[PDB]
Amino acid sequence: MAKQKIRIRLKAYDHRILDQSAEKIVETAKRSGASVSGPIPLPTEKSVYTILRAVHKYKDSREQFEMRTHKRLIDIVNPTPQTVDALMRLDLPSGVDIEIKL
Amino acid sequence: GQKVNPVGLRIGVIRDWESKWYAGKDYADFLHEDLKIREYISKRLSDASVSKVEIERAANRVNITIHTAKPGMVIGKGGSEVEALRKALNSLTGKRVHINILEIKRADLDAQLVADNIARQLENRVSFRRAQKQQIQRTMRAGAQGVKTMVSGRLGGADIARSEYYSEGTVPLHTLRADIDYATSEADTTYGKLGVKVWIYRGEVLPTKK
Amino acid sequence: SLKKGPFVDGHLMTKIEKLNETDKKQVVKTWSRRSTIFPQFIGHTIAVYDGRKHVPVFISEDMVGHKLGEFAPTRTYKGHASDD
Amino acid sequence: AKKSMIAKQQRTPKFKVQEYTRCERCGRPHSVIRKFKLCRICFRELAYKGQIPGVKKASW
Amino acid sequence: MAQVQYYGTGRRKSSVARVRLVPGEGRIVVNNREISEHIPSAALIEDIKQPLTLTETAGTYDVLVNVHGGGLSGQAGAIRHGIARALLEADPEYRTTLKRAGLLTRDARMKERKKYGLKGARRAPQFSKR
Amino acid sequence: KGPVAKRDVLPDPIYNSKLVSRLINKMMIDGKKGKSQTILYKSFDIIKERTGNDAMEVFEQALKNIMPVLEVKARRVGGANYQVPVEVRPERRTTLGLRWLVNYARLRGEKTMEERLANEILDAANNTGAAVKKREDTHKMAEANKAFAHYRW
RNA sequence: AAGAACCUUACCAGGUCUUGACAUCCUCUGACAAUCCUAGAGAUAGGACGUCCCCUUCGGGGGCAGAGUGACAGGUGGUGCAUGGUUGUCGUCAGCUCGUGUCGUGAGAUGUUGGGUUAAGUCCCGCAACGAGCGCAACCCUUGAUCUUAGUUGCCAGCAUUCAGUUGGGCACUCUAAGGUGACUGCCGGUGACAAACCGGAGGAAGGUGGGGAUGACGUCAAAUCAUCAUGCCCCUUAUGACCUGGGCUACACACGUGCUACAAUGGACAGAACAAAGGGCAGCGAAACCGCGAGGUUAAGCCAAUCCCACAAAUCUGUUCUCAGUUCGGAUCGCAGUCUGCAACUCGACUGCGUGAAGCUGGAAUCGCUAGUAAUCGCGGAUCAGCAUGCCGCGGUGAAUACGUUCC
């Protein structure tokens, strides 16, 4: 009964942009479609960075700026071509890492 | 410190980054092109002026929207100027471009503009004290819960060095919802450069839910 | 070093080759001290460029795998105050 | 001599090993992270300027 | 789908455990291994088994537990808090004696993140005047 | 300020009592509960082997025998130091007892650490050894010079 | 200094250039650019093979080179006793001030003192003062409890399957990240003016600013950085500039600061067994198979990664063995033979095999850290990075002793 299915994945630094993008990318899945799996959470990987405060010495004082990387997955049992043609247009967001695979 | 920049704290919790995008195979190259766009907008800062440019990119696309106190300076007559700028940027970025424009209401309220203006006043060799007073009066005309301002380096050419600051109303940088605008500027008198700083407390932001 | 093999810059190779086949010229300066001594190179005397001054160096049969520039120390001794 | 140094770097090295990392915004070599090719101070000032998401600062 | 059993998650310092109090002989099972075997010897294992003995004594219920993360003592402590909370879910009435026992809460504590300029997230290597 | 709360130790299963757990705390080095565990059980075993008696009894008599009744406390009010004798807190009593116990046990020089802990604890049982001698020395520094610490301070 | 073999590098020595290595204006031709040979250490010069492109009725447009030319360009040159900018320090200490008014000839004072209370100028009450601003606090992040939404690459309990959560299935649970719940002295009791607050107890996953981080107030030290950048002034310019080879930044009689490894039987050595977290990876991580004692190599699957790889956790536990000594303690120093990276490992790289087996058997005077998951200690990862991490930044394992107290520093 198992069969290959399209499984779009999203990635972004900001999360509000990411789950707004998730809602926008599943909303097209809902119309002219069926089932529509929700956006399941992924572990997310941050990158820490310690940098010196002073231009010269005083290495004892520093600061940690870091960049987290969120990830998400979305699925749909029915390929439904009409919402795939609808999928081609995406006004938002400029900052998103959608990836399509079947 | 002794004074950490509020702009380095406000971002994230209460304000958006000046340039948002995603990366990507080349995180550096997007940053290079964007910093170059800053380098040319800085050339546009010479007279047309700008408070800030917001930037967005999505693979072979860019959204370098501008907001400025004087919108017609960059548009020109017939809109030819924004087009020529669009070509000058298209020649460099190597990708499609469509620069946007915005006209801020009560533009004096913005920290970048008042800081650039008082800096130009320092270029005009007007007394720095009276200039800061006119700053506080003008921002008072702008209407705000609290405002602070500061200048450093040579002042009137007197003494080896001096630093001054004036303020009125609450200016709570330690507040995490303060939404305080921050600005810096660099005057260039023959006696020497003049450091410029200004803090603008727009007021607390109340979180929403639906 | 490692394998295949010791590495002269290669100009010294043709130089010592021509000097071996004929002429038998003696005493020649070199800036490239990195080159290792070779069996074909034997018996030659090279002025070694330490930097400050060239130091002439005869080549005994015993020396091959040692670097040609190793024999001349750039370092100046010692220098110390009250000896003994 | 930073102009001579960036001129030295932008030109192709005689050997590929020679290419040390350096930021474009400033000509200072040394202590430049390779992953972002920015100055520690370059990245510092841009960090107060805010160039990338997000939080910032000193979490976890 | 078999006979009814209670279960209680129990973690400590990044070491999580999933106990299952199935009634039976009372022999304990950790990762398909005996507690006498999985952590020899180790006497502390009896301290992992103490809360059941401190409460009336004794059933004794069989335990099928699956634990992951942490070291041996940490995962064993996870077995302890895990059988403790499961015993809490056994009957509501027992909880009163449990207040005297403490033996719950799992006090969250774990090694502190290192401070910059410090080796032990508190310790400073050295100081010297002049 | 004020007094601080102190945690009670998890009781040792063998022999039940928490005080033995206090020994598990003190004898331990490099943060190893297991090494203290092995030396503890081997200690009970070697006590079981020579001169038969309950380990808890000889241990109890030993710890009762190694607690000082008084302790001096140096204070420089003027020229040269001046120790002040005072009655010891029972927690401080067992603390000094166990610390001088493990310390002198460490220096016994025997090839087996457990056997010399045994010889030491039996020396405490027999009113002898370096530990009892040291408590006696503290007893000498005390009493003989308690007059400055009579009821003054 | 988040990587000095060359480069970096600035400094030295030698060899070379003067509108220049780098930017612009002019006139001005011409595409620019490369393919090799010759001489040289390179730097570059001497030759040929070569470029001679794109839009225009001929003026041109375009990068770009070359030529000359005045301009200029250039300095990690001097000045942090000219600075902007950025950062230490007292100090995450609770103070520093202003508006109005009052008092004082005046400077100044009152407010900010006093009583109680607090980590706090914290709150409360009173007070010739009433307010307010910058801080503390709160607001944020992280950690812990729980719910809801959402179940793959992650998850395996209930079911069958298998060498294997691996494969059917399950999407409970662990786990994952969004929105919520929760702590506020609030509930009780006592003290206190019935105020603030403290103490005790209950409730509770966490109790009395829960733990940690971020958050550093007016200012002090003419504190640090002209050498990140920017630059006032001063100085140099066929040279304080530029190119290159080699050096040096690693010196060596010694002093000091700061780490690492040990001086050993709670141990060393061997064998077996067992528990992590977090991070990194496509110019990359590189499994498995095979070759070599080892380091690595040959070859190559998979992985843009909750899939796969870096990758095995180490202490520990279980036994065997040595039986108290410069030792089966420790590893220094050096020799020989290999290996990774790189045009290239002499100066001045790392690692391995073999051999050699310093000193040190716990350290004077003196001095440092730390109140609990802290000290103690064991391994792992990353930034750095061709190669080079005992340093730095993190991750987790194991995990205490003591705090009577403000006499003294």
Automatic annotation (TrEMBL), chain A:
<dbReference type="InterPro" id="IPR036838">
    <property type="entry name" value="Ribosomal_uS10_dom_sf"/>
</dbReference>
<protein>
    <recommendedName>
        <fullName>Small ribosomal subunit protein uS10</fullName>
    </recommendedName>
</protein>
<dbReference type="GO" id="GO:0006412">
    <property type="term" value="P:translation"/>
</dbReference>
<dbReference type="GO" id="GO:1990904">
    <property type="term" value="C:ribonucleoprotein complex"/>
</dbReference>
<dbReference type="InterPro" id="IPR001848">
    <property type="entry name" value="Ribosomal_uS10"/>
</dbReference>
<keyword id="KW-0689">Ribosomal protein</keyword>
<dbReference type="InterPro" id="IPR027486">
    <property type="entry name" value="Ribosomal_uS10_dom"/>
</dbReference>
<feature type="domain" description="Small ribosomal subunit protein uS10">
    <location>
        <begin position="7"/>
        <end position="101"/>
    </location>
</feature>
<dbReference type="GO" id="GO:0005840">
    <property type="term" value="C:ribosome"/>
</dbReference>
<dbReference type="GO" id="GO:0000049">
    <property type="term" value="F:tRNA binding"/>
</dbReference>
<keyword id="KW-0687">Ribonucleoprotein</keyword>
<dbReference type="Pfam" id="PF00338">
    <property type="entry name" value="Ribosomal_S10"/>
</dbReference>
TrEMBL record, chain B:
<dbReference type="InterPro" id="IPR036419">
    <property type="entry name" value="Ribosomal_S3_C_sf"/>
</dbReference>
<dbReference type="InterPro" id="IPR004087">
    <property type="entry name" value="KH_dom"/>
</dbReference>
<dbReference type="InterPro" id="IPR001351">
    <property type="entry name" value="Ribosomal_uS3_C"/>
</dbReference>
<keyword id="KW-0687">Ribonucleoprotein</keyword>
<dbReference type="InterPro" id="IPR004044">
    <property type="entry name" value="KH_dom_type_2"/>
</dbReference>
<keyword id="KW-0689">Ribosomal protein</keyword>
<keyword id="KW-0694">RNA-binding</keyword>
<dbReference type="Pfam" id="PF00189">
    <property type="entry name" value="Ribosomal_S3_C"/>
</dbReference>
<comment type="similarity">
    <text>Belongs to the universal ribosomal protein uS3 family.</text>
</comment>
<dbReference type="GO" id="GO:0003735">
    <property type="term" value="F:structural constituent of ribosome"/>
</dbReference>
<feature type="domain" description="KH type-2">
    <location>
        <begin position="37"/>
        <end position="105"/>
    </location>
</feature>
<dbReference type="Pfam" id="PF07650">
    <property type="entry name" value="KH_2"/>
</dbReference>
UniProtKB/TrEMBL annotation, chain D:
<keyword id="KW-0689">Ribosomal protein</keyword>
<keyword id="KW-0694">RNA-binding</keyword>
<dbReference type="GO" id="GO:0015935">
    <property type="term" value="C:small ribosomal subunit"/>
</dbReference>
<feature type="binding site">
    <location>
        <position position="42"/>
    </location>
    <ligand>
        <name>Zn(2+)</name>
    </ligand>
</feature>
<feature type="binding site">
    <location>
        <position position="39"/>
    </location>
    <ligand>
        <name>Zn(2+)</name>
    </ligand>
</feature>
<dbReference type="GO" id="GO:0003735">
    <property type="term" value="F:structural constituent of ribosome"/>
</dbReference>
<dbReference type="Pfam" id="PF00253">
    <property type="entry name" value="Ribosomal_S14"/>
</dbReference>
<protein>
    <recommendedName>
        <fullName>Small ribosomal subunit protein uS14</fullName>
    </recommendedName>
</protein>
<dbReference type="GO" id="GO:0008270">
    <property type="term" value="F:zinc ion binding"/>
</dbReference>
<dbReference type="InterPro" id="IPR001209">
    <property type="entry name" value="Ribosomal_uS14"/>
</dbReference>
<comment type="function">
    <text>Binds 16S rRNA, required for the assembly of 30S particles and may also be responsible for determining the conformation of the 16S rRNA at the A site.</text>
</comment>
<comment type="similarity">
    <text>Belongs to the universal ribosomal protein uS14 family. Zinc-binding uS14 subfamily.</text>
</comment>
TrEMBL record, chain E:
<keyword id="KW-0689">Ribosomal protein</keyword>
<dbReference type="InterPro" id="IPR014721">
    <property type="entry name" value="Ribsml_uS5_D2-typ_fold_subgr"/>
</dbReference>
<dbReference type="InterPro" id="IPR023035">
    <property type="entry name" value="Ribosomal_uS9_bac/plastid"/>
</dbReference>
<dbReference type="GO" id="GO:0003723">
    <property type="term" value="F:RNA binding"/>
</dbReference>
<dbReference type="GO" id="GO:0022627">
    <property type="term" value="C:cytosolic small ribosomal subunit"/>
</dbReference>
<dbReference type="GO" id="GO:0003735">
    <property type="term" value="F:structural constituent of ribosome"/>
</dbReference>
<dbReference type="InterPro" id="IPR020574">
    <property type="entry name" value="Ribosomal_uS9_CS"/>
</dbReference>
<dbReference type="InterPro" id="IPR020568">
    <property type="entry name" value="Ribosomal_Su5_D2-typ_SF"/>
</dbReference>
<keyword id="KW-0687">Ribonucleoprotein</keyword>
<comment type="similarity">
    <text>Belongs to the universal ribosomal protein uS9 family.</text>
</comment>
<dbReference type="InterPro" id="IPR000754">
    <property type="entry name" value="Ribosomal_uS9"/>
</dbReference>
<dbReference type="GO" id="GO:0006412">
    <property type="term" value="P:translation"/>
</dbReference>
